[PDB]
């Protein structure tokens, strides 16, 4: 009996638990995707590889298994590579699998069809990259790519399959023996007791301790241990954007609504899978109070992240589950409690800030402003705490992050570390496919334009996605003009563009709403029915910042 | 009070325990090296940066602290980068620090003095690379370089210091607060009990178990735990080249002299800091018996090393110290012992091969052969078990590895994973500088030519190095000729070259020997006196392999 | 009849005029070098690939045909790559040919012998790179490499030959038809008449015109046209270092001895194969007088060199031969003459500077200084105007460049654009091999250490090289000390090292000299006899600058 490279690739993926392939067909991988579908894998075909890649990336975040993006050679590979780079930047496990052309023609730069040394091009832009020349090495190649994607700091891996590989024929028994079911692809890594003891001694010296939960903490799926660490220590916490919901955002220990005071006045800060990068002002400047006022404890699987920005006095290296559980054990044995004055200081700021926002969510101005629209969507998420929220834009992003409380972990998927516009539709597809939950995508109209053709994809697979476009006719605002009076302003779109009518062009439901009540009712009907829906919400073009 | 970039660099290195800088002076780092020496660091200046880089590399292997190599820009940086890449390949911790030119001129490719984007050029060839533009970030830049060099799988890191950096002046108190004394640069990483349990179950099922000790196990400096694992399990072991001496090479559990049988007939193999790369035939082929006859347990800090070549049924990820002690604990609690007939099989094969070799060591040919010369040096090392052996060549390498038993760990420094000719004199310098031990460098005459100029360096610092050149007039052999009769053959050197005269050029002792007894007496005199010595040993040009 | 990869490689090289291979043997190219020698090519084997690479680089400068450097994989390839990058920086045609390992193992990063994707690693560091997978494409691969090396701006090209290539067998007639004898490898490129007209108009407007001859003009081998352009226009000229001797350095139109005045006070400058890089202060600052005082005409084959640093009002793009001849034809038809007052100004400045230098050449100090030693060697070169001068160091370089007049083109080979220490012995080998001329290598003692082992290569091939080491015991000077009193100073060597004894080690002539008369006598004897000779010249350790 004989097998070929086509079947070995699919067999290796199936053996290792891959159930979905995100892709765009074409030479030389169309028949690979057809075979994947015939062998029971779900194959999702997109309108652009970048969106297939974004889907695979967030599938990795949601599941701790590498999402698979399959593309053609050079131009399609480059489209996927952009998403793979973003996956690496965000620590999402993902494998970009791409066909490539004739090795000897490419090696001589003779102008092959879609010629590119895709292995060499990918390496500066992703965590690891491999190329498989022989059918008998497909099993090990897939194993190397899975291990690179999910171990250590997870990230994007490139796997290059030359067209010639797929049609190679080898003995079927030799083939099956060549496959590898990876054992312990993402091993636990436990910290040394001395590192835990040092972290505990710093934490116990704190007068104003603070926990910061990053999306690495959400990714780790150690929800019970993270919640117990916060609740049994009594230490207030601030969630980063995609750690919202790991503990309910309304939790009594959250200082999220008092973030400025917590960051400025704390003295010991425990970072749980959160980098001191631009989102935390690099641990420097007035955001963190006076220089010398902060000691940092940091839990991270990547030892090289310690001392990346400022001195880390108590580095704790290992997987978050192991590290949090070791810390929690120590707190259970010896911990005085968190200082009461500090908690009361933060509770007062939290209540004052919430009270200041509260009237803004109720103001019923016409045109609808960002606050009143998002006040309605806040209620949707409270009523549907298992729904997934996709969110991108500028005002649409920053205001939604502050106003919409999340209640369950890994339900908020947004622009991430690189602040990428364009993840929305790819993320919505993967969220619906991987979780089976309803998806609410809250999109700026500029952000939506980077991936908006994928609404046809959403319709084609009848995915339960409700898209809300905050249509303010522009980037940030819709009011800029050309001072020469000849063209539109550089930051505007066609006024009152009807994105809902675009959705209807592919058979989805389109709604045009102009009030918070209309928005609420339309979202409710979409999420109750599961029908692909796009709601075009008129937002005041002068509202928001900038 | 004010400080400057010059002083901040030296302060940051001193703060983190750097005591030695290997370098070659020149613009823009001559004054940096002078200040290091003025501030009490030992500064070793070489004749070529590649040798200064090799010294730093093996200094990292010997100490588990990054060896520091300091170079000028573009051409000197490239010389050091070749050694940094070799350090990375061998998992040796090392920091290449280079000056670079004017950022704005290099960025526009205008033809600066020694113009090169050294940061961009280094990244494909080493583990990590950083460039420091502002004096206040020197402390963090040094901290990042240190952590990347020694954590995880150790390797070579590039630290780029533009010439303008050194002259920047900042407040001395701000300068001091910006320095970082790295906490736990190389953290312990402990494996999960489930992974150890899996490995123990495989090991207990073995009828013919084998331990392979790689140079990762030697580097880890967990000597007592590694020896206890071998001795208390009773499992025979094979040491890779630079793991020789971790346990005495004459240890009764060593199957090193029955290596071929041990690899072929074992059923369970425990790899301890050793890769299934070309040195172990990729775990494939006749070296390892019949396909499917082997189950591998592998201990390694790098999770991505698992399944690199063949399926690893029991991966154990962590630092070697933590993992071998966890295994040892499990063996102590439940171990039936290694099967006796397996040890008997290997012991018989070991004694038979040692006997086959014994007559070759005493046969006193004329001219001297490799075996009889190396028989004298075997005795030297047996009599001086704390001396360091540097070794490179072809016959001179492979025959010395088999004939010269090592008795203490980390005393054998050789060509390593890339089989590099050229590490000899650099390794000898760092060995002598770092340890204070006598050094015996056993060098092929071709191998020696790659770094031979550094005998002046050895003389200049009065280092206790005894160099033995196995002078067979060529690469592998001295007999090849030009079939056209016009030139020397491509693989020979000047016949009867007297490298001892080259040593005397720099005030060292130079000796010419023709017999094993003359060799033994000359080596004894050199190593007793500690004077820099080069012994030119006349070896039969027709002796050896090839 | 059948042929193989080994033979096709040698056949392709022979077909295109390759007569010499510089190399270091080893797997997988030892048998390739043997076959080359058996088929009549001269094969020069070095002690380190970087020196073989330097030889190939200057062979390209000397001959306008790519020098061939042949190396093993990863570590030897990296050594050669450093010289290939330097060739690219200096615009020297060169091909680095390296063996590489098993493509499928390297592509999976499984740890092949000397594993490296050398194609991908080479590309950021040279002009072009190709890899040849199939024997039938060897002919085209060699054609591609030759064309890339010598066309456009010449430079270094990497040609990768996997080990499996050499033993492929194909039909001998197919093999013969697959070979390519390159037609017009370095085509002439003629400038548009309108660019020449523009340049002539600027030149005719000049009150103080100046020609600058760079080593591109020397490389071009348009000697008669360049000399005619200078002599028939009557415009004074300044030669860059390796354009010295294109016209005799004593030529009445040379302003080389009045360089500062020529650059500062000229108004129109004609660059002929010379970049406004660091060697010409980027066309900025006080070197060039007041801002706005200069108009540049530039002749270069590389259109992208125009406006690299400052605005070029008359760019002329093409090969120097064609462009100089087109300028010359314009001058012959209509030219008023260079203003004779400007020539008078430069003549007076030249005569004053030479008179200020004359006493220092005759000052018979003890110990010998740089000036009195170089005064002797100035006379040597005057008496031997066909000899080749290799020169490197700091004081030994800068003072020799000023003091030693060259009389014939392409006789001065030095550190070049990157200021590399280490080109000396490789350049000397290639000069002697390619030209058959006597070679005088004037070497700093620090500079010599970077390639000094190759004196054995010089002896092995009995090359007419006379090496003079300016032994001042250190870098720039020999007087620096360790302020802690523990070690030698960072910039010194063993005091009164006898490098001449190192030459005796390999059967060459060693001489120690202390006065200019002893030096002159020793050089005369060495260059008269053609015997490989190294003269150790004692230089005052406090003389010179820096
Ligand atoms: N399973 C894990 N265990 C430990 N650390 C992890 C794990 N997964 C990701 N990380 C770390 O979590 C961090 C996430 O940082 P960031 O992406 O900056 O989160 P946010 O943007 O929420 O701050 C990264 O440093 C990554 O190494
Ligand atoms: N402290 C350590 N703990 C665990 N593994 C280590 C440690 N230091 C190095 N290693 C691993 O040891 C291995 C060395 O393998 P190799 O260099 O191939 O040794 P040899 O050449 O002797 O087989 C590498 O896989 C490296 O990741
Ligand atoms: N045959 C040629 N015809 C025209 N320009 C050439 C030719 N060969 C080299 N060049 C140019 O000559 C210049 C040499 O510049 P440089 O190397 O800076 O010379 P120097 O260092 O003497 O100034 C380069 O710009 C290169 O493109
Ligand atoms: C790929 C990419 N391109 C451009 C940007 C810059 N950018 C930041 S926010 C934004 C759009 C903001 O407008 P919108 O989504 O309509 O949100 P609004 O503020 O109007 O609610 C853009 C284009 C980006 N982050 N990513
Ligand atoms: C940098 C580098 N260049 C070339 C080689 C190829 N090579 C392998 S062994 C060797 C020298 C073997 O000759 P020698 O050192 O004299 O040992 P012998 O067998 O003669 O005792 C060389 C050049 C290499 N491994 N590394
Ligand atoms: C590869 C490389 N490394 C380092 C340097 C820095 N450098 C510039 S000149 C010089 C040596 C100067 O000393 P020497 O050759 O003895 O000449 P001297 O002034 O003493 O005559 C060095 C090492 C360089 N140019 N290239
Ligand atoms: Mg908008
Ligand atoms: Mg030899
Ligand atoms: Mg000197």
Residue numbers in the entry:
A (entry chain D), B (entry chain B), C (entry chain A): 22 to 567
Any passages from the paper?
To gain insights into the specific active site topology of MeOXC, we solved the crystal structure of the enzyme at a resolution of 1.9 Å. Overall, the structure is very similar to that of OfOXC root-mean-square deviation (rmsd = 0.425 Å for 7230 aligned atoms). To increase the GCS activity of MeOXC, we sought to systematically alter the active site around the ThDP cofactor with ISM. Based on the crystal structure, we identified eight residues in the proximity of the ThDP cofactor as targets: I48, Y134, E135, A415, Y497, E567, S568, and I571. However, the catalytic efficiency of MeOXC with formaldehyde (kcat/KM = 2 M–1s–1) is far below that of RuHACL, which is the best performing HACL known to date (kcat/KM = 110 M–1s–1). Additionally, the KM for both substrates is extremely high (formaldehyde: 100 mM and formyl-CoA: 3 mM). In the first round of ISM (R1), libraries of positions 48 and 571 contained only variants with reduced activity, suggesting that the isoleucines in both of these positions are critical for catalysis.
